[PDB]
A paper describes a structure:
Each unit cell contains two protomers of the [name] [name]-[name] [name] complex, with similar conformations. Protomer 1 (with the [name] [name] in chain A and the [name] [name] in chain B) has slightly better quality and is used for analysis here. The electron density of the [name] [name] (chain B) is very well defined in the map except for the sidechains of K347 and E349 located at N-terminal end of the [name] helix (omit map shown in Fig. EV1). We found that the [name] [name] forms a single α-helix and binds to a surface valley of the [name] [name] formed by helices α1, α3, α4, α5, and α8. Numerous interactions between the hydrophobic residues of the [name] [name] (M161, I162, F163, I205, M212, V239, V291, and V294) and [name] [name] (A365, I364, Y361, A357, L353, and V354) are observed. Surprisingly, we found that the [name] [name] peptide binds in the opposite orientation to the [name] model presented by Griffith-Jones and colleagues (compare Fig. 1A with Griffith-Jones et al). Therefore, although the reported NMR perturbation and mutagenesis data appeared to be supporting the AlphaFold model, the interacting pairs of [name] and [name] residues are completely scrambled in the [name] model in comparison with the experimental structure due to the flipped helix orientation of the [name] [name]. The binding mode of a small peptide might be affected by crystal packing, and the [name]-[name] [name] complex might exist in solution with an alternative conformation or with multiple conformations. Our structural elucidation of the [name] [name]-[name] [name] complex has provided molecular evidence to clarify confusions caused by the [name] modeling and accelerate the development of [name]-[name] antagonists to dismantle a key enabling feature of cancer cells.
Author numbering:
A (entry chain B): 347 to 366
B (entry chain A): 100 to 312
Amino acid sequence: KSEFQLLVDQARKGYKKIAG
Amino acid sequence: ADAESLFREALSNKVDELAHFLLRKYRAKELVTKAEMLERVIKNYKRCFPVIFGKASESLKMIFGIDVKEVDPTSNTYTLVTCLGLSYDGLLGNNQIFPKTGLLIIVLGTIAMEGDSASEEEIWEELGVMGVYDGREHTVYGEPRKLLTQDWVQENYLEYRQVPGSNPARYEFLWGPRALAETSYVKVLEHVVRVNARVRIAYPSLREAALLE
């Protein structure tokens, strides 16, 4: 929702793709 | 509208607030204590410190690549250092707010996951999942093409060359000598596995926060 919250969720998605 | 909703938003705002406070502490090259955070950031939510500090620490690690490590246990003193022992943070020239170590680690980790190199297409695929796009200036990370093909190449973290015998042109990315010296494929892959496997901290409800008190 917040700009910072989205930045955290997007970094989380980046780490998930590499780990896969 | 709801009391529990406004409480979660208050805690979420403190994570944002503490995260930027820790970032300012890193750029100022100073230590931080628990008492300093309890008094200057989360004065009215002190007993929620483990949740707030834990969420803010992990965000600094994932986004900016800064580690918040306790120096002295009895003093609750923490130091702010780049992840994986890298000597680069991108705080140079006109970029004096946001470290670029986090994105470099994500690129280095993408390449190591692929083997001896990753093509340009799958670097842009991985970056696109984080809202990072060729030719677009991200609000935090900046423009990625320049970061990938100029900054990090000239810093010797990355190599950007054309695939041997291409028709038509085709490019890929590799670890430069500085990346191989400061860290390794094994240490970076382990970092990615640790980040991805960390159990999320839940925001305490009002009732659970009342048990803490």
